[PDB]
Structure 1
């Protein structure tokens, strides 16, 4: 399975965002296409799409922002013909920071949406 191959273009599972943005930049079209193709061709495969934010701003603000990030990714794959039934958009807000520093580098790493492929 390509989903288990670390050299497959499918190994890349994170989309990053600008400050305060939920726009999925153009550079991510081929990655969305790769994942979409995998999904459409494997009807049984389910992906959890988790939106994350950096720590700046309110708990509620960043929960809402994280949601919009996960939805932006789902939507981009929706548009490529993936069934809604294989996709779930959720938000972790600022609660699961991947980098734990308090600077531009850590924040940028946390303004992120991950494709979490289900067992």
Structure 2
């Protein structure tokens, strides 16, 4: 049906709240085609709401040392930022934080834990 432009933003945010994670390859920090549509929806939202900022989380797997794992975390959030920047989102609206391997989603040493910890999360 046709909605009020108010709960239209509500439903919109819900989609942005739900699907804010870009998953990465092992040691790979390039954005896949799957999240393009996803990020293109984040971008359109952000530059329509100039006074709203997103923070991108950077995450690496257990392998490596915690301090150097920061490096892999930042470049993954940088690709996300750059993609949104290409779509027109201002640097003003974005800041990135890399945690390295400090905040896992899953625990263990199975690849299942690894693959889902190799992520880039967008928090509003």
Question: Given the two structures, how large is their TM-score scaled by the length of structure 2?
Answer: 0.87
Shift in Å at residue 102 of structure 1? Answer: 1.1
2:114 counterpart SS class: helix
1:109 counterpart SS class: helix
1:48 counterpart SS class: strand
2:47 counterpart SS class: helix
Residue equivalent to 1:27: 34
Question: Given the two structures, how large is their TM-score scaled by the length of structure 1?
Answer: 0.90
1:54 counterpart SS class: coil
Take 1:10 and 1:38, find their aligned partners in 2: how far apart are those partners? 12
Query: Is 1:81 matched up with 2:84?
Result: no
Shift in Å at residue 74 of structure 1? Answer: 0.3
Q: Which 5+ residue runs of structure 2 have no aligned equivalent?
A: 1-9
Residue equivalent to 1:101: 108
Take 1:9 and 1:72, find their aligned partners in 2: how far apart are those partners? 18
The CA RMSD over aligned residues, in Å, is 1.2
Residue equivalent to 2:47: 40
Work out whether residues 10 and 34 of structure 1, in 8 Å CA contact, stay in contact via their aligned partners in 2. Answer: no
Q: Which has the larger radius of gyration?
A: 2
Residue equivalent to 1:92: 99
